[PDB]
Structures are given as structure tokens and as C-alpha cells.
Symmetry: D2
């Protein structure tokens, strides 16, 4: 899995399930080109976003729709979304896990980057 | 001060000093318009970005240049920047403090929103 | 103020007000001796816990009563408390700010250490 | 797995491998009784700490030796250890994953609690 995203709920102590996100890749004109998307599973994980051959050097943005997640729980959150912007594959392929821990007024994110 | 940003360094246990950031506001055509910018002080704080009159309802993005901060310390970090996107003042004027806690592969961010 | 603690609420986007905490110092017999205690103010800050003369080298524990805070809001939280254990002043006098960002099932904590 | 601990390194973007920890359970005299222990694997995970039958209601403390982890990397960290103190199994068995994200001057922790 070249790119996986895992989302956790800090209020309820659970995976954040059915969280939608889009992934973009920065184009030469500095616009954000659509790249991948999906929703987290019952484990809070989104696998299968891309393949090693398609996932080359670039600046990538994961835009996680945290607002819809909190709204469905009756909570008015601070952020429009949580976004994670990073350069990937600049030294050749790596495997990336992006984790996000969500609260209504806060989020934390980290990356685990592994060499295949 | 209707908007203040405070940035902390989780590696060195210090304020994150001289961190550049840019604030944008979403325009009617869904474009990000430049709104304000500045650098954190010796306390890790950036004051004076805007005024009560100028800080109208809208969707704002604070883009913190974490990459340059880490690179100046000899660290090749994961993120291009740490960004915070939020609706402001849609229920009347509020004061916002955005805090960010930085590590090379991770960041946490929260908001303190107060009604004056 | 050689030691200050600041506590923030990630659910409500506010300082965590009236949060009790107890500070202990490790005794020569490896027991935790009571050192100081107090409650956060309306700003989420607790000042005046100790003095430069009293805050000698040692191992200190700050135990923040997060459980009572959440229970007063009707939330059954995960942790009994958030605690921070650290050696202080072993290279000479320093000023310490301990910050904690609270959610029902999660907390983040950092330290800002400055040389006066 | 009734109790699993996962530890991540926010400086290097990797699992925190070979991190030692002890688990204690509060006794009737308010002393901390030894309960379980181990070291994280190459995935940053420590499995097999306990069994469902042995893991009953109590207050548990996971004490993670983060200081030795940072010292081995030549880093002088803030905390003596990271500790996570929580009541478990008060409503009967649950499965607990404790995650900790480590930086030299900061840590974040969350719990994922699932009903079998
Ligand atoms: C708002 O003013 C302050 C915030 C903080 C720390 C905020 C913080 C701490 C964390 O552990 C995580 C996080 O995302 C934010 C410290 C001193 C301040 O004066
Ligand atoms: C539980 O499983 C996993 C948790 C995480 C990340 C947890 C985490 C992330 C943060 O940004 C902050 C925090 O306190 C905890 C990553 C991979 C996993 O498989
Ligand atoms: Na390269
Ligand atoms: Na309105
Ligand atoms: Na000394
Ligand atoms: Na019960």
C-alpha cells in the first residue's frame, strides 16, 4: 500500500468511520489536480488510493472532510477540513501512512514513511 | 487582536521563532485571496495580522511555513506547511487564537475561540 | 514564575477553566512528595505554583485532574488524569511552561523551557 | 487482543521500535501493582500484554520509557516517561488500543476502545 490514511476520533475513542477525503497532486501551474479519493472503512482506514507506478514525485494534498463527520454527530466543529500537504517519492518510492486524530476544535496528524 | 497565531517547537521545547505564515480568505469566486502575513516573534506569537473592522465573516486559511523552519535547522521535514482552514465570525465577532505544535513528521493544531 | 501550566479544551475550543492539578516531587526515598497544587484560571493558566528558591533540581510530576473536568461536562472520559513527569533545573535554573490539550479519549502535552 | 500499545516517532516518521514499557494496576492500598510489560516490535506495537480473563476492572497505568528511546538517538528529552492512566473494564470486557506519538519535548496519546 503506497498510500494509506487512518483517521481516529479523540472524542469517542474509536476509529473515525465513513470519513470522506480527496487527494490532489500539485500541477506545473500550481493548481491542485485530482489524484485519488475515498472514505474510511469501519477500521478508520482508507487503503487502495493509488499504486506504486502511479504514485511518483510530487506535492500531494490529502483533504479530509472532518466538518461533515462532526456535523453528523451534532457537533459544530472549527475546521472546514483537515489537510495534509507533503512532498512524496522525491527519493523514489516510499510507503506512506498518514494518520489524523480528530477533535471538534483540534486535529493532530503524523506520517509513517517506510522504504520498500 | 481578533486573530493571533502561536507556534511551538516539540523537538527543542521552545517557541517556534521566525516562522513565516500567510493568511488567505476565500473570495466569492472560490479563489484564495491574500489576506495577511507575518512571522512569529521570540515568544512564538504573531499578533496584529488584522483588525476587528477588516476581519469579516468568511472562510480563512492560515498556512504556516513549517518546511522552511525545519530546513533552517538542518531537518528535512514531511509537510510542505501546516494549514488551518476555518469559518470565522459567522455568528458575530469572535477572537481567535490558533496554536500549532510542530515536529518534523507531525503537527497538532487547536483553536481557542472567545466571545468579547 | 518558574513553573506555569496551561490547559486547553479541544472539544469546546476554549481554555480549560477550573482544572485542578497537583504537583509532586520525588523524595530521596523514591516517594512522591506533595509539592504544590492549584486550579486553572479563566485563561486556562495556573501561575504561582512555586518560587525560584523553592523550585530546586528534582524529578517533578504534574498530575492534571482531567477526569473531574470532563465529568462536570457530562462526559465519561478515558483517562484518570493527564500527567507530566520530568527532571527540572538539573543544568541550572530554567522557566517551564507545561501545556496540555485535552479531549475525552486523548491528550497532548508539550513543554516550553527557557533560560532566564 | 485485550490491550495493545502502539508507539510512533514524530521526529523520524517511523514506528518507535524497542520501546520498553511496564503496566501496573492500582491496588486497594493505592499502590501500583505490577501487571504486564514488554517492548514494542518493529511495527511499533506491543501485543500479548494480557488476556481477557486476567484483565478485569481496575485503574491501569502504562509507563512508557520514552527517555531511554530518545537517549539512544542522542537526544536529551523532556519527560522521564510517558504515562497513560485509565480505568478499564468497568462495564465488562473491552479491547483497548493505546497509541502514543512521541517527540523530545512532547507526547500525544489516544485510546481506541472497542466492545467485543
Ligand atoms: C494558546 O496559547 C498557548 C498554547 C500552548 C500550547 C498549545 C498546544 C499544546 C499541545 O500539546 C498541542 C497543541 O495542538 C497546542 C502553550 C502556551 C500558550 O500560551
Ligand atoms: C491505532 O493505530 C494507529 C494509530 C496511529 C496514529 C495515532 C495517533 C496519531 C496522532 O496524530 C496523535 C496521536 O496521539 C495518536 C497510526 C497508525 C495506527 O495503526
Ligand atoms: Na531526490
Ligand atoms: Na450568520
Ligand atoms: Na547538574
Ligand atoms: Na460499571
Amino acid at each position: 500500500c503506497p498510500l494509506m490514511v487512518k483517521v481516529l476520533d479523540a472524542v469517542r475513542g474509536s476509529p473515525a468511520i465513513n470519513v470522506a477525503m480527496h487527494v490532489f497532486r500539485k500541477a506545473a501551474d500550481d493548481t491542485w489536480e485530482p489524484f485519488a479519493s475515498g472514505k474510511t472503512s469501519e477500521s478508520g482506514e482508507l487503503h487502495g488510493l493509488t499504486t506504486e507506478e502511479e504514485f511518483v514525485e510530487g506535492i500531494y494534498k490529502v483533504e479530509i472532510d472532518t466538518k461533515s463527520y462532526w456535523k453528523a454527530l451534532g457537533i459544530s466543529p472549527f475546521h472546514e477540513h483537515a489537510e495534509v500537504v507533503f512532498t512524496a517519492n522525491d527519493s523514489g518510492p516510499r510507503r506512506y501512512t498518514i494518520a489524523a486524530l480528530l477533535s471538534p476544535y483540534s486535529y493532530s496528524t503524523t506520517a509513517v514513511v517506510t522504504n520498500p
